[PDB]
Ligand binder design. Structure first.
Ligand code: NI
Length: 341
């Protein structure tokens, strides 16, 4: 049964609620983004209206085979009427196609559902600037002050400089980047751009990338692994055994691997600056864990919320333990007393 924080009161709507069967009273199912914990339950047998971005709808049709007649793509930054209710989709600064959803309820209440997001000051100049929000359904993934990490631009600068140095020292080195979902594509696209290479990958991953409306993508990716010196592999294979096995398959073209594992936050963030990051190495294989986040840091979250000044906050992440729930409620009250709302 569908939990309360996935229902939008005063409407027929749910958000990211496909794993509960037919939800009683739901006339439209919204999908914020194409990550498995959120789409869990969708397939070609789904027969209710799904509302989402254009990119999410490309992925629903081609990857999950949802029939076209049930997919309702909406443009961003545009007031739309869905089943008698005004809604707007906003870019969430998460993975490709990810949105926040603003609902203008018939009784005058305004609700913002962030989906998954990486808060940014640029959101203070979206269609959010124009009106009051009563309720905020908030991505609280990193809602504690110990969660610190660098900007995405600093992380990419580290990765480009590291890859370019290694391959210029050794033109026979291969670069490998781990993936298990959409998101974080700038990691492998930026490295391949500096090296003058296309990114090589499986047919299944190429298919997923072709749904993403990335400009000039045909110029950047390929299924011909032999033509490429940046390869994508499943995240599970980014270890010494998996990379050894991959290097065997390359027919003696290469004699070294430099690999990247984009993670979220890890506890080595509490001690080490991005500049000072070092790899794990065994023989001719080195693995870098890089803290490329597509969720808000604590400070970015706090800034957004203090600017929006919502009347009530409903967390959507870390909701399963009493200790998590009490910690998050404490920070919400600090933020409100500090800012005066
Ligand atoms: Ni996500």
């Amino acid at each position: 049964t569908c939990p309360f924080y996935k229902k939008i009161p005063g409407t027929g709507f749910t958000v990211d609620a496909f794993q509960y069967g037919v939800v009683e009273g739901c006339t439209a199912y919204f999908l914020t983004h194409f990550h498995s914990d959120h789409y869990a339950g969708l397939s070609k047998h789904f027969t209710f209206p799904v509302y989402c971005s254009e990119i999410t709808g490309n992925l629903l049709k081609n990857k999950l085979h949802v029939q076209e007649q049930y997919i309702h793509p909406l443009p961003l930054d545009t007031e739309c009427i869905v089943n008698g209710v005004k809604v707007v989709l906003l870019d969430a600064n998460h993975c490709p196609g990810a949105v926040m959803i603003l609902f203008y309820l018939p009784n005058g209440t305004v609700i913002l559902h962030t989906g998954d997001f990486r808060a940014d000051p640029s959101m203070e100049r979206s269609l959010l600037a124009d009106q009051k929000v009563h309720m905020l359904y908030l991505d609280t993934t990193y809602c504690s002050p110990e969660y610190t990490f660098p900007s995405q631009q600093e992380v990419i600068r580290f990765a480009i400089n590291t890859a370019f140095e290694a391959v210029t020292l050794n033109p026979h080195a291969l670069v490998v980047c781990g993936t298990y979902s959409i998101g974080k594509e700038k990691v492998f696209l930026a490295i391949a751009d500096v090296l003058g290479s296309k990114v090589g990958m499986s047919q299944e991953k190429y298919k997923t990338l072709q749904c993403l409306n990335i400009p000039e993508i045909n110029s950047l990716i390929t299924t011909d692994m032999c033509s490429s010196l940046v390869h994508l592999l499943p995240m599970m294979q980014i270890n010494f055994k998996g990379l050894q096995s991959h290097l065997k398959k390359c027919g003696g073209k290469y004699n070294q691997i430099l690999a990247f594992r984009p993670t979220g936050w890890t506890h080595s963030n509490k001690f080490t600056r991005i500049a000072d990051v070092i790899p794990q190495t065994k023989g001719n294989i080195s693995i870098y864990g890089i803290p490329y986040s597509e969720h808000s840091s604590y400070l970015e979250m706090k800034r957004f919320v203090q600017w929006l000044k919502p009347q009530k906050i409903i967390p959507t992440v870390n909701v399963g333990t009493w200790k998590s729930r009490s910690t998050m409620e404490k920070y919400f009250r600090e933020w409100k007393l500090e800012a005066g709302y």
